Amino acid sequence: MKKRLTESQFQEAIQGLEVGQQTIEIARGVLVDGKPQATFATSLGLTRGAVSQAVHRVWAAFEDKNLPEGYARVTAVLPEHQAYIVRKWEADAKKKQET
Amino acid sequence: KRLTESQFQEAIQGLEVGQQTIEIARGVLVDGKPQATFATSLGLTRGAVSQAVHRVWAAFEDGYARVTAVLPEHQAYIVRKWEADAKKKQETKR
């Protein structure tokens, strides 16, 4: 990452999305305001996983609408060395997209 | 087999599930009720119930990191196979 969205991108993300208002507020706070997830867990009395779950739903909604040709979205838990390779792949991807 | 409420609380913190999953897991692992009671009461498959209980138990039992990325399809498929091969390894390990 970082994983960020403008308000305009955020609206596109939730456009026609089945999602509750609390999920939206957390998602907004994390993705467009840039706040850490742990703060929303503490303030709202939610587990860190519930918060992560809310952020992911909106982020995924956006990406699924903005996948370049030949690309796909993945979320997965991986041993650290594999996570390292993914980051490299992600960075390489981004440079090509930019170009 | 079983968990304390203290252990239960600890195990559910990182889980991305709905309250139903959590409540089934409490009933089975903390209060000790059979799984089939929840499949029957709620109208769930036994698989959905076993999966709910397992997620919570595995969280108690268990060099890893969470990644989220958009990649060229060939790499996306590899991540999914890695994840799969990793969970079947963590299934046995020994």
PDB file of C-alpha atoms in Angstrom:
ATOM      1  CA  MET A   1       0.000   0.000   0.000  1.00  0.00           C
ATOM      2  CA  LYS A   2      -0.719   2.928   0.898  1.00  0.00           C
ATOM      3  CA  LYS A   3      -4.413   2.391   0.089  1.00  0.00           C
ATOM      4  CA  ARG A   4      -6.181   5.712  -0.390  1.00  0.00           C
ATOM      5  CA  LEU A   5      -9.208   7.109  -2.199  1.00  0.00           C
ATOM      6  CA  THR A   6     -10.579  10.577  -2.857  1.00  0.00           C
ATOM      7  CA  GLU A   7     -14.174  11.300  -1.841  1.00  0.00           C
ATOM      8  CA  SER A   8     -15.146  11.080  -5.513  1.00  0.00           C
ATOM      9  CA  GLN A   9     -13.565   7.626  -5.780  1.00  0.00           C
ATOM     10  CA  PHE A  10     -15.192   6.672  -2.490  1.00  0.00           C
ATOM     11  CA  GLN A  11     -18.640   7.562  -3.838  1.00  0.00           C
ATOM     12  CA  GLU A  12     -17.975   5.494  -6.950  1.00  0.00           C
ATOM     13  CA  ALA A  13     -16.920   2.632  -4.665  1.00  0.00           C
ATOM     14  CA  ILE A  14     -20.125   2.632  -2.596  1.00  0.00           C
ATOM     15  CA  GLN A  15     -22.361   3.459  -5.570  1.00  0.00           C
ATOM     16  CA  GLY A  16     -24.945   0.677  -5.542  1.00  0.00           C
ATOM     17  CA  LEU A  17     -23.011  -1.200  -2.865  1.00  0.00           C
ATOM     18  CA  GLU A  18     -24.909  -3.101  -0.171  1.00  0.00           C
ATOM     19  CA  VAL A  19     -23.259  -1.630   2.890  1.00  0.00           C
ATOM     20  CA  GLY A  20     -24.321  -0.160   6.233  1.00  0.00           C
ATOM     21  CA  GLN A  21     -23.648   3.408   7.336  1.00  0.00           C
ATOM     22  CA  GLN A  22     -21.180   2.460  10.084  1.00  0.00           C
ATOM     23  CA  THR A  23     -19.103   0.474   7.574  1.00  0.00           C
ATOM     24  CA  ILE A  24     -19.068   3.542   5.326  1.00  0.00           C
ATOM     25  CA  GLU A  25     -17.937   5.841   8.143  1.00  0.00           C
ATOM     26  CA  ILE A  26     -15.038   3.582   9.097  1.00  0.00           C
ATOM     27  CA  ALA A  27     -14.149   3.109   5.441  1.00  0.00           C
ATOM     28  CA  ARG A  28     -14.231   6.853   4.824  1.00  0.00           C
ATOM     29  CA  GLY A  29     -12.096   7.518   7.891  1.00  0.00           C
ATOM     30  CA  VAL A  30      -9.452   5.017   6.823  1.00  0.00           C
ATOM     31  CA  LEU A  31      -9.410   5.401   3.038  1.00  0.00           C
ATOM     32  CA  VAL A  32     -10.078   9.130   2.396  1.00  0.00           C
ATOM     33  CA  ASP A  33      -9.100  10.675   5.751  1.00  0.00           C
ATOM     34  CA  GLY A  34      -6.082   8.405   6.234  1.00  0.00           C
ATOM     35  CA  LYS A  35      -6.715   7.345   9.817  1.00  0.00           C
ATOM     36  CA  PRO A  36      -5.445   4.067  11.324  1.00  0.00           C
ATOM     37  CA  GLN A  37      -7.957   1.241  11.744  1.00  0.00           C
ATOM     38  CA  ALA A  38      -7.116   0.715  15.422  1.00  0.00           C
ATOM     39  CA  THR A  39      -8.681   4.072  16.294  1.00  0.00           C
ATOM     40  CA  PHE A  40     -12.060   3.000  14.888  1.00  0.00           C
ATOM     41  CA  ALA A  41     -11.884  -0.291  16.768  1.00  0.00           C
ATOM     42  CA  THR A  42     -11.328   1.522  20.055  1.00  0.00           C
ATOM     43  CA  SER A  43     -13.824   4.360  19.556  1.00  0.00           C
ATOM     44  CA  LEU A  44     -16.667   2.151  18.309  1.00  0.00           C
ATOM     45  CA  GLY A  45     -16.048  -0.873  20.535  1.00  0.00           C
ATOM     46  CA  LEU A  46     -15.314  -3.086  17.536  1.00  0.00           C
ATOM     47  CA  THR A  47     -12.718  -5.787  16.987  1.00  0.00           C
ATOM     48  CA  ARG A  48      -9.788  -4.904  14.736  1.00  0.00           C
ATOM     49  CA  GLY A  49     -11.062  -7.589  12.385  1.00  0.00           C
ATOM     50  CA  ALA A  50     -14.520  -6.031  12.153  1.00  0.00           C
ATOM     51  CA  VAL A  51     -12.831  -2.756  11.239  1.00  0.00           C
ATOM     52  CA  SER A  52     -10.536  -4.430   8.692  1.00  0.00           C
ATOM     53  CA  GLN A  53     -13.605  -6.149   7.274  1.00  0.00           C
ATOM     54  CA  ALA A  54     -15.366  -2.807   6.746  1.00  0.00           C
ATOM     55  CA  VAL A  55     -12.385  -1.141   5.049  1.00  0.00           C
ATOM     56  CA  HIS A  56     -11.791  -4.118   2.765  1.00  0.00           C
ATOM     57  CA  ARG A  57     -15.403  -4.248   1.562  1.00  0.00           C
ATOM     58  CA  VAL A  58     -15.297  -0.687   0.244  1.00  0.00           C
ATOM     59  CA  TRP A  59     -11.743  -0.883  -1.107  1.00  0.00           C
ATOM     60  CA  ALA A  60     -12.557  -4.104  -2.938  1.00  0.00           C
ATOM     61  CA  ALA A  61     -15.703  -2.542  -4.386  1.00  0.00           C
ATOM     62  CA  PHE A  62     -13.609   0.267  -5.860  1.00  0.00           C
ATOM     63  CA  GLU A  63     -10.895  -1.942  -7.339  1.00  0.00           C
ATOM     64  CA  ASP A  64     -13.395  -4.342  -8.894  1.00  0.00           C
ATOM     65  CA  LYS A  65     -14.640  -1.322 -10.835  1.00  0.00           C
ATOM     66  CA  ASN A  66     -11.148  -0.132 -11.817  1.00  0.00           C
ATOM     67  CA  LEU A  67      -9.152  -3.245 -12.719  1.00  0.00           C
ATOM     68  CA  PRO A  68      -6.860  -2.700 -15.693  1.00  0.00           C
ATOM     69  CA  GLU A  69      -7.025  -5.239 -18.509  1.00  0.00           C
ATOM     70  CA  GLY A  70      -5.207  -8.441 -17.631  1.00  0.00           C
ATOM     71  CA  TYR A  71      -5.362  -7.743 -13.885  1.00  0.00           C
ATOM     72  CA  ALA A  72      -7.175  -9.326 -10.943  1.00  0.00           C
ATOM     73  CA  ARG A  73      -7.706  -8.600  -7.252  1.00  0.00           C
ATOM     74  CA  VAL A  74      -6.306 -10.793  -4.471  1.00  0.00           C
ATOM     75  CA  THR A  75      -6.561 -10.784  -0.706  1.00  0.00           C
ATOM     76  CA  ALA A  76      -4.769 -13.500   1.222  1.00  0.00           C
ATOM     77  CA  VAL A  77      -2.706 -14.226   4.309  1.00  0.00           C
ATOM     78  CA  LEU A  78       0.770 -15.463   3.438  1.00  0.00           C
ATOM     79  CA  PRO A  79       4.062 -16.349   5.104  1.00  0.00           C
ATOM     80  CA  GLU A  80       6.357 -13.318   5.165  1.00  0.00           C
ATOM     81  CA  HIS A  81       8.668 -14.287   2.292  1.00  0.00           C
ATOM     82  CA  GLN A  82       5.730 -14.663  -0.080  1.00  0.00           C
ATOM     83  CA  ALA A  83       4.309 -11.340   1.096  1.00  0.00           C
ATOM     84  CA  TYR A  84       7.683  -9.853   0.144  1.00  0.00           C
ATOM     85  CA  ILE A  85       7.390 -11.119  -3.428  1.00  0.00           C
ATOM     86  CA  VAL A  86       3.828  -9.798  -3.723  1.00  0.00           C
ATOM     87  CA  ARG A  87       4.991  -6.295  -2.783  1.00  0.00           C
ATOM     88  CA  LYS A  88       7.683  -6.499  -5.456  1.00  0.00           C
ATOM     89  CA  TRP A  89       5.114  -7.668  -8.009  1.00  0.00           C
ATOM     90  CA  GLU A  90       2.825  -4.868  -6.895  1.00  0.00           C
ATOM     91  CA  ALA A  91       5.528  -2.230  -7.284  1.00  0.00           C
ATOM     92  CA  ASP A  92       6.561  -3.564 -10.692  1.00  0.00           C
ATOM     93  CA  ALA A  93       2.910  -3.525 -11.789  1.00  0.00           C
ATOM     94  CA  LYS A  94       2.453   0.086 -10.672  1.00  0.00           C
ATOM     95  CA  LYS A  95       5.475   1.379 -12.597  1.00  0.00           C
ATOM     96  CA  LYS A  96       4.184  -0.222 -15.809  1.00  0.00           C
ATOM     97  CA  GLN A  97       0.695   1.230 -15.259  1.00  0.00           C
ATOM     98  CA  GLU A  98       2.180   4.685 -14.691  1.00  0.00           C
ATOM     99  CA  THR A  99       4.342   4.437 -17.806  1.00  0.00           C
TER     100      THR A  99
ATOM    101  CA  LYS B   1     -12.341 -28.672  22.130  1.00  0.00           C
ATOM    102  CA  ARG B   2     -13.269 -25.847  24.520  1.00  0.00           C
ATOM    103  CA  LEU B   3     -12.321 -22.218  25.243  1.00  0.00           C
ATOM    104  CA  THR B   4     -12.709 -19.803  28.152  1.00  0.00           C
ATOM    105  CA  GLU B   5     -14.517 -16.513  27.525  1.00  0.00           C
ATOM    106  CA  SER B   6     -11.109 -14.929  28.019  1.00  0.00           C
ATOM    107  CA  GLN B   7      -9.542 -17.158  25.373  1.00  0.00           C
ATOM    108  CA  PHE B   8     -12.621 -16.756  23.194  1.00  0.00           C
ATOM    109  CA  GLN B   9     -12.423 -12.953  23.293  1.00  0.00           C
ATOM    110  CA  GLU B  10      -8.747 -13.059  22.369  1.00  0.00           C
ATOM    111  CA  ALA B  11      -9.332 -15.403  19.442  1.00  0.00           C
ATOM    112  CA  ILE B  12     -12.134 -13.401  17.749  1.00  0.00           C
ATOM    113  CA  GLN B  13     -10.409 -10.001  17.680  1.00  0.00           C
ATOM    114  CA  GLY B  14      -8.700 -10.464  14.308  1.00  0.00           C
ATOM    115  CA  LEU B  15     -11.530 -12.311  12.577  1.00  0.00           C
ATOM    116  CA  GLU B  16     -13.393 -10.831   9.622  1.00  0.00           C
ATOM    117  CA  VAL B  17     -16.758 -12.499  10.217  1.00  0.00           C
ATOM    118  CA  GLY B  18     -20.332 -11.618  11.133  1.00  0.00           C
ATOM    119  CA  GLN B  19     -21.761 -11.856  14.651  1.00  0.00           C
ATOM    120  CA  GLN B  20     -23.542 -15.114  13.793  1.00  0.00           C
ATOM    121  CA  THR B  21     -20.167 -16.826  13.303  1.00  0.00           C
ATOM    122  CA  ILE B  22     -18.945 -15.501  16.639  1.00  0.00           C
ATOM    123  CA  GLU B  23     -22.140 -16.534  18.422  1.00  0.00           C
ATOM    124  CA  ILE B  24     -22.053 -20.064  16.989  1.00  0.00           C
ATOM    125  CA  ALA B  25     -18.421 -20.383  18.052  1.00  0.00           C
ATOM    126  CA  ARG B  26     -19.178 -19.214  21.595  1.00  0.00           C
ATOM    127  CA  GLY B  27     -22.027 -21.686  21.938  1.00  0.00           C
ATOM    128  CA  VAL B  28     -19.887 -24.588  20.762  1.00  0.00           C
ATOM    129  CA  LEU B  29     -16.478 -23.816  22.251  1.00  0.00           C
ATOM    130  CA  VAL B  30     -17.330 -21.902  25.430  1.00  0.00           C
ATOM    131  CA  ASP B  31     -20.749 -23.185  26.474  1.00  0.00           C
ATOM    132  CA  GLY B  32     -20.053 -26.628  25.062  1.00  0.00           C
ATOM    133  CA  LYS B  33     -23.199 -27.169  22.986  1.00  0.00           C
ATOM    134  CA  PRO B  34     -23.087 -29.508  19.954  1.00  0.00           C
ATOM    135  CA  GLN B  35     -22.570 -28.053  16.465  1.00  0.00           C
ATOM    136  CA  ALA B  36     -25.635 -29.782  15.016  1.00  0.00           C
ATOM    137  CA  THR B  37     -27.821 -27.717  17.354  1.00  0.00           C
ATOM    138  CA  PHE B  38     -26.773 -24.551  15.540  1.00  0.00           C
ATOM    139  CA  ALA B  39     -27.095 -26.026  12.056  1.00  0.00           C
ATOM    140  CA  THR B  40     -30.620 -27.023  13.033  1.00  0.00           C
ATOM    141  CA  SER B  41     -31.692 -23.853  14.866  1.00  0.00           C
ATOM    142  CA  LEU B  42     -30.330 -21.381  12.322  1.00  0.00           C
ATOM    143  CA  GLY B  43     -30.751 -23.403   9.128  1.00  0.00           C
ATOM    144  CA  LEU B  44     -27.065 -23.703   8.290  1.00  0.00           C
ATOM    145  CA  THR B  45     -25.139 -26.518   6.660  1.00  0.00           C
ATOM    146  CA  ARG B  46     -22.911 -28.479   9.013  1.00  0.00           C
ATOM    147  CA  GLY B  47     -20.017 -27.232   6.895  1.00  0.00           C
ATOM    148  CA  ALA B  48     -20.874 -23.589   7.532  1.00  0.00           C
ATOM    149  CA  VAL B  49     -21.058 -24.345  11.250  1.00  0.00           C
ATOM    150  CA  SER B  50     -17.831 -26.367  11.351  1.00  0.00           C
ATOM    151  CA  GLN B  51     -16.127 -23.562   9.435  1.00  0.00           C
ATOM    152  CA  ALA B  52     -17.399 -20.978  11.924  1.00  0.00           C
ATOM    153  CA  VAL B  53     -16.089 -22.991  14.873  1.00  0.00           C
ATOM    154  CA  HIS B  54     -12.785 -23.803  13.159  1.00  0.00           C
ATOM    155  CA  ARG B  55     -11.929 -20.175  12.380  1.00  0.00           C
ATOM    156  CA  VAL B  56     -12.224 -19.311  16.051  1.00  0.00           C
ATOM    157  CA  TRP B  57     -10.363 -22.404  17.268  1.00  0.00           C
ATOM    158  CA  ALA B  58      -7.560 -21.934  14.731  1.00  0.00           C
ATOM    159  CA  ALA B  59      -7.221 -18.345  15.945  1.00  0.00           C
ATOM    160  CA  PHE B  60      -6.602 -19.725  19.434  1.00  0.00           C
ATOM    161  CA  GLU B  61      -4.121 -22.392  18.297  1.00  0.00           C
ATOM    162  CA  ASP B  62      -2.249 -20.169  15.839  1.00  0.00           C
ATOM    163  CA  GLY B  63       5.765 -15.521  10.454  1.00  0.00           C
ATOM    164  CA  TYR B  64       2.751 -14.470   8.389  1.00  0.00           C
ATOM    165  CA  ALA B  65       1.250 -11.305   6.903  1.00  0.00           C
ATOM    166  CA  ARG B  66      -1.977 -10.162   5.227  1.00  0.00           C
ATOM    167  CA  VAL B  67      -1.676  -8.768   1.698  1.00  0.00           C
ATOM    168  CA  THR B  68      -4.178  -7.098  -0.599  1.00  0.00           C
ATOM    169  CA  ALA B  69      -3.174  -6.271  -4.162  1.00  0.00           C
ATOM    170  CA  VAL B  70      -4.301  -5.993  -7.773  1.00  0.00           C
ATOM    171  CA  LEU B  71      -1.900  -7.929  -9.960  1.00  0.00           C
ATOM    172  CA  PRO B  72      -1.488  -9.407 -13.425  1.00  0.00           C
ATOM    173  CA  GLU B  73      -3.799 -12.428 -13.480  1.00  0.00           C
ATOM    174  CA  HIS B  74      -0.948 -14.943 -13.608  1.00  0.00           C
ATOM    175  CA  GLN B  75       0.375 -13.610 -10.296  1.00  0.00           C
ATOM    176  CA  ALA B  76      -3.092 -13.386  -8.747  1.00  0.00           C
ATOM    177  CA  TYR B  77      -3.538 -17.102  -9.448  1.00  0.00           C
ATOM    178  CA  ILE B  78      -0.190 -17.872  -7.836  1.00  0.00           C
ATOM    179  CA  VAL B  79      -1.142 -15.980  -4.672  1.00  0.00           C
ATOM    180  CA  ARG B  80      -4.328 -18.027  -4.431  1.00  0.00           C
ATOM    181  CA  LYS B  81      -2.422 -21.289  -4.877  1.00  0.00           C
ATOM    182  CA  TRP B  82       0.182 -20.180  -2.321  1.00  0.00           C
ATOM    183  CA  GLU B  83      -2.534 -19.332   0.197  1.00  0.00           C
ATOM    184  CA  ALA B  84      -4.202 -22.683  -0.441  1.00  0.00           C
ATOM    185  CA  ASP B  85      -0.952 -24.657  -0.190  1.00  0.00           C
ATOM    186  CA  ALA B  86      -0.135 -22.726   2.979  1.00  0.00           C
ATOM    187  CA  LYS B  87      -3.387 -23.632   4.747  1.00  0.00           C
ATOM    188  CA  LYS B  88      -3.098 -27.324   3.837  1.00  0.00           C
ATOM    189  CA  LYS B  89       0.422 -27.187   5.264  1.00  0.00           C
ATOM    190  CA  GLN B  90      -0.820 -25.517   8.443  1.00  0.00           C
ATOM    191  CA  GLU B  91      -3.509 -28.219   8.536  1.00  0.00           C
ATOM    192  CA  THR B  92      -0.938 -30.949   9.197  1.00  0.00           C
ATOM    193  CA  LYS B  93       2.530 -29.439   9.628  1.00  0.00           C
ATOM    194  CA  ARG B  94       3.679 -31.613  12.565  1.00  0.00           C
TER     195      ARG B  94
END
